[PDB]
Amino acid sequence: RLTFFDTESVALQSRLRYAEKQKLFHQELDRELAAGHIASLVAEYDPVATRLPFQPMQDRYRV
Amino acid sequence: NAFSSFDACRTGLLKQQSAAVENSLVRQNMADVRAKALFERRAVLLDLVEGK
Amino acid sequence: AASTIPISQWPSLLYAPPSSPANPAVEALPEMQFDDLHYPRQMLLCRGAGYSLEQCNRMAQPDARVTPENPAEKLLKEEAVAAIACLSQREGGKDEQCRYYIERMYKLANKE
Amino acid sequence: PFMWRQRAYCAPVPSAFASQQGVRKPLLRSNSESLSVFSQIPDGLLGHTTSVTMGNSDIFFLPKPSNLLKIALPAFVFMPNLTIFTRAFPFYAHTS
Numbered sequence: 001r002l003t004f005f006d007t008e009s010v011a012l013q014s015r016l017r018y019a020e021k022q023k024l025f026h027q028e029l030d031r032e033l034a035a036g037h038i039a040s041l042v043a044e045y046d047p048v049a050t051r052l053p054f055q056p057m058q059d060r061y062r063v
Numbered sequence: 064n065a066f067s068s069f070d071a072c073r074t075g076l077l078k079q080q081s082a083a084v085e086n087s088l089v090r091q092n093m094a095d096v097r098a099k100a101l102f103e104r105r106a107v108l109l110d111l112v113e114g115k
Numbered sequence: 116a117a118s119t120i121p122i123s124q125w126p127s128l129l130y131a132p133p134s135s136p137a138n139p140a141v142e143a144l145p146e147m148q149f150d151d152l153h154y155p156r157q158m159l160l161c162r163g164a165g166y167s168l169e170q171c172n173r174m175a176q177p178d179a180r181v182t183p184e185n186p187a188e189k190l191l192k193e194e195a196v197a198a199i200a201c202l203s204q205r206e207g208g209k210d211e212q213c214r215y216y217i218e219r220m221y222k223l224a225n226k227e
Numbered sequence: 228p229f230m231w232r233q234r235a236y237c238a239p240v241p242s243a244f245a246s247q248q249g250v251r252k253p254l255l256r257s258n259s260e261s262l263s264v265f266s267q268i269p270d271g272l273l274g275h276t277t278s279v280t281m282g283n284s285d286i287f288f289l290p291k292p293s294n295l296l297k298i299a300l301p302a303f304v305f306m307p308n309l310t311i312f313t314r315a316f317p318f319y320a321h322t323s
Contacts, residue, residue: 012274023265030257034239037231048087053095071163078162
């Protein structure tokens, strides 16, 4: 049967590769959306608040 | 004609960031100075306080 | 007769509202706009170009991307002025004193 | 990508805000993955689960004692006799 009477295997393999592509696309998309959500916080971020009273600001916190 | 507007918005954001840093520094320093003055006032008032 | 509209049908209720004696232009509801970012964006662009606050405030102009104007104000101009005169003279058209002009305008605008 | 504080389904998982954790697992994940079945679980045996077949179990056997009966029984007609009056069937089928 497998040697002369099988096309379901090939069809299912093709469909599964298609499914893998689809899965990875959706994954990357969700990652990008979450990253944009986090990027919305860079506006709230204030690097001066890290400063200690009567001390200079550090370039480490992206002046 | 489009790169002009893009660069304008870009420089606007940069200026916003710079001004934010400067204003935050000024406000922070004023607040800290006021706190220090309050602390010294409290010190003198504790030296003047009376009771047991 | 007027049945409750569940919360799931509100998006369609906003752009296809029920009939009323004073209906809006449903065909124009998607065209009603009022930008809250107009002046902030204008100032940002000008300051990025390199102008000062005073120059920006002098160059600022009000938004043109607002809800369009009613074409009746340009097509039925004379009839509207006559109706407004009738109202000013007859106390707002009490007891049907401007029915003449109002009906002329209604016919002109509706055409059966 | 417009209303982040109002769209929590498109937001990162709380383990992402924590700043702490061959190949490692990703640091950034979203809640929108909950809308996919095979996001986290594997696709193993995906197209092979409808192939596990089991046969039916009905047995078509019933003793037929006719020595008990001495009368005929009514029987149904299942199809019209097309071997007779074949040419007129569409014309007389609607009558009775």
